[PDB]
Amino acid sequence: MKESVRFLTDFGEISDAISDLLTSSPNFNVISAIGPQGAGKSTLLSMLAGNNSRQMYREYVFRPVQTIQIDIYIVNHQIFLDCQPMYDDSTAMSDTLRLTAFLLYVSHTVLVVSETHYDKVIIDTLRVAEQIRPYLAIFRPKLAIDRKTNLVFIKTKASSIDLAPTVIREREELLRLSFQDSRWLKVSQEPFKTLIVLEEFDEQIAELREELQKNREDFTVETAAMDEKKWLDMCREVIRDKTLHKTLKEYQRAMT
Amino acid sequence: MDIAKWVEHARTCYSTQLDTKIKVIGVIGKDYPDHGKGDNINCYLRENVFPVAATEDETCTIRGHFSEDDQILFLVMNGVDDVANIRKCLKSNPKSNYFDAMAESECQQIRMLHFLFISCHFIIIFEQTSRIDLELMRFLKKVNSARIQLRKKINQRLVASDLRDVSFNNRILSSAESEGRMVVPRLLIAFQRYEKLEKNLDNQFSDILKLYDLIDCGASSLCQLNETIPVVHLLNPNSFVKFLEDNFRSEKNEISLENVIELMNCLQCVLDGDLEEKHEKTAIQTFIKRIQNDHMEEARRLYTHLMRFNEATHYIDSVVGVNSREALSQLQAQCNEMWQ
C-alpha cells in the first residue's frame, strides 16, 4: 500500500476492500493506537510503519483528514490500526468505548497515546472497555480465552520534567496498579517500557518497533492456526456478536 | 490542614478574631511534578502553605488554611487524581477490584466538591492541559445531582446549627435557591501556558457550563459566573493576583469567621455521608453489577449435567472480568442445586 485506507465502511461495518489486502500467513502482528485528538497519534504510528523523520507531510502514511472510523495499513505482515480520536454526552462515550473494546480484542498490543499520562479517565475507559466482550465459542480455530492484550502508554509532546526517571517510574507504578487485576489487558513490568515519553528522534521508534513484537500473545489456543486473512473473520464475528451488543446497551443505560 | 481537624481547634487558635468578616474560597486542581494544586494560592500568600504533592494521609480531604492578613479561608481539595490516592486505592486491598477501589475515592470527591459549592464565595479551577477538563464537568453534574437530592436534609442542618439566617453576602436568595447552601459560588478558571484569546474561552467556558446544567438553571444551578468582571485567566510559568482581587474586592466581606468555623463543622455530615442512603453504587459499579447478573443468567441458560456445566463455565471464563473467581464458584453452587 502507498498510504492508509479506511478499515470500516458505514455503520461500523468492515470494508470489503481490505480482505484482498491480507495474506495467508500466520506471522502477522496487529498494533492499534488510541488517544485524544491533539496527541499526534496518527503521526507517531506512521513511523512505526516505516516513515522517516525527514519525510514530507504528504508522505505520512497516516494523514488524518461517518461517525466512527479506523485506518488500516500493512507493511510486511505488520497490521497497524489507527483509531479515530477519543472524545455528545452518552453517544460520544459509547462510541469511544465501542472502538476501544474492539481494538483491545483484535490487537496484540495497543498504543495509548496522550499528553496526560497518568490520566485516570483514560484508564477508566480502558478498564470498562475490557468488560465489553464477545462470546466466540463456535469460532474455529478455537481462540485463546486467558489471552491478554499488551498496552504501551506513550506520552507525546512532553516537557523535560516528564523525562525525569523518577517521574516515569511514579506514573509507571500507577499504570501497573491500574492493570494488576486486569484479566484481558496486560502491561509490562520492566522500568521505562510501559510509559514512553517523547518531546516531539528516529532511533527511539526503531527500538520501539523492535520491541512491540516480543510480548504478543497468539489469538488461538494452538500456534499458527489463524492467518491474517482469517484474523479479519474474527473481526467480523466480534462486531456481530450479540453478547457484546447487550453489554454495550447496559453501559449506555447506566450512563443515562 | 484537614478541615475535620481544622474545626476542632479553630475557635481557640483565633479566639481573638472571631468577629472578623472573611471569605471562603475553594480551589480545584491537580498535582504535577514540582507543582501542586495550591502552588498558585500559596504564591498569592507568599508562603508555601500546601505541599507540592498530597501525602497518603492527606488524600480525599479538603485542606483548609485561613490567612488572617487577607481575611480568606482557602480550601484546596485533594481528589482522586493525586498520586498518593491512586496508590492508596489500588493497594489498600489486593482482594478487591479496580472499579470498587476507585469508586470510594470518587464518592468522596463528590462530597468534597458538594462541600465546597455550598459554602465558598468563589471557587477557582486550575488547568494546565490547555483544554477544559470535561470529566471535572461530569463530576460537577453528579455533584449538582447529589446536591439536589440532599439539599433538603442539609438545609435543616443549617437550621439546627443556626446558620440559615446568617448572611453570606449582599445577595438575597429564594428558598429554592438557598436550600441546602449558603451561597451560589462564583466560578473562576485559570489556565497555565492575546486579549481575544481569553475572551474566546469565556464563551467556551460558559457554554460547557450550560451543557451540564451548572449555570443559568435558577435554583437548580450549582454555581454562577460574573456579569462584567473576568472569570478566565491565563498564567505564565503578577497579572494573576490582580485577577483575584478584582473578584474579591467586588464583594464586601460579611460572614464572620466564627460562623464559618461552625459552617465547616455543620457540613461535616456531607463529608461523612451521614445524609445519604445506604449502598449507593457508582454508574460504573451499577454497570458492572448488571452485566455480571446477566452473565450469570445466560450461563444458567447454557446449563438448561457434565457437558452442561462445562459450557456454562467456559462462557463465564470468557466474558466476566471482575470477581471472576467468586462468579465461577458461585455458579458451581447454582448447578449443584439444579442437579436436584
Residue numbers in the entry:
A (entry chain B): 59 to 123, 134 to 155, 172 to 284, 308 to 363
B (entry chain A): 1 to 193, 211 to 254, 289 to 355, 384 to 419
Quote the study on this structure.
The SMG1 kinase is an essential NMD factor in metazoans and is associated with two recently identified and yet poorly characterized proteins, SMG8 and SMG9. We found that SMG8–SMG9 is a G-domain heterodimer with architectural similarities to the dynamin-like family of GTPases such as Atlastin and GBP1. Nucleotide binding occurs at the G domain of SMG9 but not of SMG8.
We proceeded to obtain the structure of a nucleotide-bound SMG8c–SMG9c complex. Although the SMG8c–SMG9c crystals cracked when soaking GTP, GDP soaking experiments were successful. Diffraction data to 2.65 Å resolution showed the presence of well-defined electron density for a GDP moiety in SMG9c but not in SMG8c. Second, there is a conserved glycine residue (Gly96SMG9) in the P loop at the equivalent position of the so-called arginine “finger” (Arg77Atlastin). At the corresponding position of Asp218Atlastin, SMG9 features a conserved lysine residue (Lys241SMG9) that stacks with its aliphatic portion on top of the guanine base. Fitting the GDP-bound SMG8–SMG9 structure in EM densities of the human SMG1–SMG8–SMG9 complex raises the possibility that the nucleotide site of SMG9 faces SMG1 and could impact the kinase conformation and/or regulation.
